[PDB]
C-alpha cells in the first residue's frame, strides 16, 4: 500500500482542532447522530473493546456510537497485556507484526523478591512468553492503544466521537426498549446539548462510575487496601548492570517486597505526535494488516515516525503498589516537593536493591503534559454493587477493580466488554420485538448471569491480590506458592481454539485461575495465617514451612489431575517438569533478543531477520528459538500449526476451558 496523509492534509487544510479531526473519520458524519441502538458513555480501551466485539460478533446490526470527553485518546495508567488480549486483536485481523510496531513486545513475567531484613537477598520467579510463530502480549501506550480501536472502530460501521461528554443529570435512561435520551454537550459551559434517542445505555466511564454510582454506592472490601506512585523513566539499551541476575527489559518485571510491589514496564511513547498524522499512521498500518503485508517488507516503527512526521522514543513505566497500612514518616520534604514524588523516592531508599536498580534509569519530566512527573492514586479496589438495570449495563472499571498487580483491570475486565457486546444484540432486539413489560422482564433474565458473574468476580480478584501481597513478605512464599499458584490455576489452556464466537464465554471462565477451588483454598490459608503477623515484622520461620509444605501438598495433587500437556520446566525457569521447585535451575526456552542497534526487544522468528523498531537487519537472524528441554522438528512444527489460525466456529463442539482439569 502507497501510503496517504489524507487526515494531515484534511486538518491542515481546515484547520481543525483534534477532535474534529477525529470526528471526520466516523462512518455516520462528524455531528452526532439524532438516535441509535447503543451509546456507549467512554472511550477508554473498554468502551471500544465493547464497540469493536458487539460490531464484529454480528454486524450490520447495531447502530453504536461511543462518546469520549477526552479530545484525543487521553492517558491511562495500565499498559500491561495478556495472551487473551494479544489474541482478541488477532481475531480482530491485527497480528503481531502490527501491533508491534506501535506497542512494546511482552514475552513473559519476571518476579524478584526482596529480602526487607537482610538488604540485598532476593529471590526470582520468572517465565517467558511464547514464540513469535505462536503469539506475543504487548505493552501499550494507552493514547495510542485507544486510537488504534477508534480508528479500527470507525472503519467497522462504530461512530467514535471525542470532545464530547454525556451529561449525566440530563440523561434519561429507561427500561424495556422504551427509550433512552442520552444528553451529550461538549462540556459544562455547552447550553446547547444533543440528545441521542437510543435503546441501550453502556457505562463505560471507568472508576468514575457516572452512570452506575446513581444505582449503588460504591462498595469497598474489609481490610487494607493500595495507594499506587508513578512516573516515567528512560529505557536503557544496556539492561546489563541492573542488580538482578537474567533480568530482561521484555517482561513485566515486579519488584516485590513486604509492603507491596514495584512494576517495570518498557514501551515505545508517541507522545509529541499532532492527533491527524497519528490517525495516517495507524490507517496506513491497518491498510497493511488488511494486505497481509510481511513483517519485514513493513516500515519500522522508526521509519513510520519519519513518514507520518511522529515523535517516537523508547520509556519505562515505573510505579509502586504498596499497602495504604504502611506508615510514613510525617516530614517527607527531603524526597520532593510533591505527595507522589515524595513517597515514590521514600520508598526507592528503604530497599538498597530497589536504589540501585532505579540508578539505571532517569525520570522524565512531563511525558504527558505539564503536571504529569508524577502520579498517585489513593484506595484503588472497589465495587460497582449494580451493573444493570432498565435500558443500561456497566463493563470495565465500572463494574469494580483491584489491582495492577498480574494485570487483571484490561485483560479479565475485557470478559465483561466482550460478554456485554454479545448480549447487546438480543437487549436490543427484545425492545424491539415485544410490549414493554415483558420486554423488560426478559431483558432482566437475560443478564441475572451477567449482573451474578460481576458481582463474585471482583472479591475473587480481591482474594487473588490479597494472597500474592501476604506471600510477597517472604523471598520463599512469592515466588513458590503464590507466583507458582497464579501460573498453575491461571495459564490459558486451549486459548488457541477461541474464536469470535466463543471469546466472551471462554473469558468469562478465566479470571486468571482466581475461581480454581484449590488455589483459593491455598490463598485462604496463608490470608488466614499471615495477616495476623503486623506489618512493620517479619513472617516467623515456621509459619512459611507450614505455608510451604501444605501449598506443595496441594499442589501436587492438583498438577497430577491436570490434563493438558505442557512442558512446565521450559516455561518456568526455576521448576522441572512436575511444578517442583528446584534450588539451581536457570534453564528454558529462549524466544527473544535486544536489538543491537536499538535496544528494542524482538521475537526471534525466522521471516523477521529485521528489526521491527528500527528497520537494522538483525546481522543475520540466525538467531533461532532455544527451546530446552529440546524439541523435534516435527514438533516445533506442530506447535507452530496450532496457533497459525483460529478455527471456525462449531456450533456443537464445547468449549475447552481455559482451568486445571477437575479431579474427578
Ligand atoms: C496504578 C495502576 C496500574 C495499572 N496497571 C494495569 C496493567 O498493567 N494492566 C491492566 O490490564 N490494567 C492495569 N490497571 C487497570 C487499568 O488502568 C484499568 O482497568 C483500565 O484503564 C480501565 O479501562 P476503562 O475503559 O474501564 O476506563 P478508562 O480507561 O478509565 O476510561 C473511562 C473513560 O470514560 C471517559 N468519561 C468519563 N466521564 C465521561 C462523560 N461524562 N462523558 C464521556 N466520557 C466520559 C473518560 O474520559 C475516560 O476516557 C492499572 C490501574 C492502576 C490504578
Ligand atoms: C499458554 C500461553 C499463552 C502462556 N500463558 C502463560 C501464563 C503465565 Cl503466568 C506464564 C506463561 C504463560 C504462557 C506461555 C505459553 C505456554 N504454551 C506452550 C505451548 C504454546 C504456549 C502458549 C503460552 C507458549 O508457547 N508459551
Ligand atoms: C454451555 C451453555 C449453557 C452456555 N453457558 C454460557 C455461559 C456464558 Cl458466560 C456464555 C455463554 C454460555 C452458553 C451458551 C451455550 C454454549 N454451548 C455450546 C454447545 C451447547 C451450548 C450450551 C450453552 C449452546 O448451545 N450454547
Ligand atoms: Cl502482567
Ligand atoms: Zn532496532
Not at 425 to 436: C, D, F, L, R, Y
Not at 534 to 557: C, Q, Y
Amino acid at each position: 500500500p502507497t501510503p496517504k496523509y489524507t487526515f494531515t492534509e484534511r486538518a491542515a487544510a481546515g484547520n481543525l482542532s483534534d477532535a474534529e479531526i477525529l470526528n471526520s473519520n466516523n462512518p455516520t458524519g462528524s455531528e452526532l447522530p439524532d438516535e441509535s441502538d447503543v451509546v456507549v458513555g467512554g472511550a477508554g480501551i473498554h468502551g471500544l473493546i465493547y464497540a469493536l466485539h458487539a460490531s464484529k460478533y454480528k454486524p450490520n446490526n447495531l447502530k453504536i456510537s461511543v462518546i469520549e470527553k477526552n479530545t484525543r485518546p487521553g492517558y491511562k495508567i495500565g499498559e500491561s497485556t495478556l495472551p487473551i488480549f494479544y489474541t482478541w486483536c488477532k481475531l480482530h485481523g491485527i497480528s503481531a507484526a502490527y501491533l508491534l510496531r506501535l506497542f512494546g513486545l511482552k514475552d513473559g513475567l519476571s518476579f524478584y523478591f526482596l529480602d526487607r531484613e537482610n538488604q540485598g537477598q532476593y529471590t526470582d520467579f520468572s517465565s517467558v512468553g511464547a514464540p513469535g510463530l505462536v503469539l506475543a502480549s504487548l505493552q501499550i501506550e494507552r493514547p495510542m492503544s485507544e486510537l488504534l480501536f477508534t480508528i479500527l472502530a470507525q472503519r467497522n460501521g462504530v461512530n467514535v466521537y471525542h470532545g464530547r461528554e454525556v451529561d449525566f443529570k440530563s440523561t434519561v435512561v429507561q427500561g424495556g426498549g422504551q427509550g433512552n435520551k442520552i444528553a451529550v454537550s461538549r462540556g459544562k459551559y455547552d447550553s446547547t446539548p444533543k440528545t441521542i434517542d437510543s435503546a441501550l445505555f453502556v457505562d463505560a466511564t471507568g472508576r468514575f462510575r457516572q452512570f452506575c454510582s446513581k444505582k449503588a454506592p460504591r462498595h469497598r472490601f474489609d481490610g487494607w487496601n493500595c495507594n499506587a506512585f508513578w512516573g516515567y523513566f528512560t529505557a536503557p539499551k544496556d539492561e546489563s548492570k541492573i542488580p538482578f541476575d537474567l533480568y530482561e527489559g521484555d517482561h513485566t518485571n515486579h519488584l516485590c517486597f513486604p509492603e507491596g510491589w514495584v512494576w517495570v514496564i518498557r514501551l515505545p511513547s508517541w507522545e509529541g505526535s499532532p492527533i491527524a498524522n497519528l490517525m495516517d499512521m495507524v490507517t496506513y498500518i491497518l491498510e497493511c494488516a488488511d494486505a497481509g503485508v510481511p513483517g519485514d517488507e513493513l516500515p519500522s516503527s522508526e521509519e513510520l515516525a519519519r513518514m507520518f512526521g511522529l515523535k517516537f522514543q523508547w520509556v519505562t513505566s515505573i510505579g509502586f503498589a504498596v499497602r495504604n497500612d504502611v506508615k510514613y514518616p510525617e516530614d517527607l520534604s527531603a524526597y520532593g516537593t510533591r505527595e507522589a514524588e515524595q513517597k515514590f523516592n521514600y520508598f526507592v531508599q528503604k530497599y538498597e536493591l530497589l536504589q540501585q536498580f532505579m540508578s539505571n534509569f532517569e525520570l522524565i519530566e512531563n511525558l504527558y503534559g505539564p503536571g504529569t512527573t508524577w502520579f498517585i492514586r489513593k484506595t484503588l479496589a472497589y465495587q460497582s454493587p449494580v451493573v444493570s438495570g432498565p435500558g443500561w449495563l456497566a463493563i470495565g472499571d465500572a463494574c469494580g477493580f483491584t489491582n495492577p498487580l498480574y494485570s487483571p483491570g484490561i485483560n479479565v475486565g475485557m470478559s465483561t466488554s466482550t460478554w456485554a457486546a454479545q448480549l447487546s444484540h438480543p437487549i436490543v432486539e427484545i425492545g424491539k420485538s415485544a410490549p414493554a413489560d415483558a420486554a423488560e422482564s426478559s431483558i432482566r433474565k437475560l443478564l441475572v448471569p451477567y449482573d451474578d458473574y460481576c458481582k463474585s468476580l471482583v472479591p475473587a480478584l480481591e482474594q487473588m491480590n490479597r494472597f500474592n501481597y501476604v506471600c510477597y513478605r517472604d523471598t520463599r512464599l512469592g515466588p513458590q506458592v503464590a507466583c507458582l499458584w497464579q501460573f498453575f490455576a491461571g495459564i490459558e489452556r486451549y486459548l488457541s481454539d477461541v474464536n469470535i464466537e466463543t471469546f466472551a464465554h471462554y473469558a468469562i471462565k478465566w479470571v486468571w485461575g482466581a475461581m480454581v477451588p484449590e488455589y483459593q483454598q491455598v490463598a485462604q490459608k496463608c490470608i488466614e495465617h499471615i495477616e495476623t503477623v503486623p506489618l512493620d515484622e517479619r513472617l516467623p520461620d515456621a509459619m512459611v514451612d507450614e505455608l510451604l509444605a501444605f501449598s506443595n501438598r496441594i499442589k501436587s495433587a492438583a498438577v497430577a489431575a491436570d490434563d493438558f500437556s505442557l512442558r512446565w520446566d521450559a516455561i518456568l525457569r526455576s521448576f522441572d517438569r512436575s511444578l517442583n521447585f528446584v534450588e539451581g535451575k536457570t534453564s528454558r526456552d529462549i524466544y527473544t533478543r535486544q536489538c543491537s542497534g536499538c535496544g528494542a526487544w524482538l521475537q526471534l522468528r525466522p521471516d523477521w531477520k529485521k528489526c521491527h523498531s528500527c528497520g537494522l537487519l538483525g546481522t543475520e537472524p540466525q538467531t533461532a528459538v532455544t527451546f530446552d528441554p529440546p524439541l523435534t522438528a516435527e514438533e516445533e512444527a506442530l506447535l507452530y500449526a496450532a496457533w497459525n489460525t483460529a478455527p471456525k466456529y462449531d456450533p456443537s463442539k464445547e468449549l475447552k476451558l481455559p482451568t486445571p482439569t477437575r479431579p474427578a
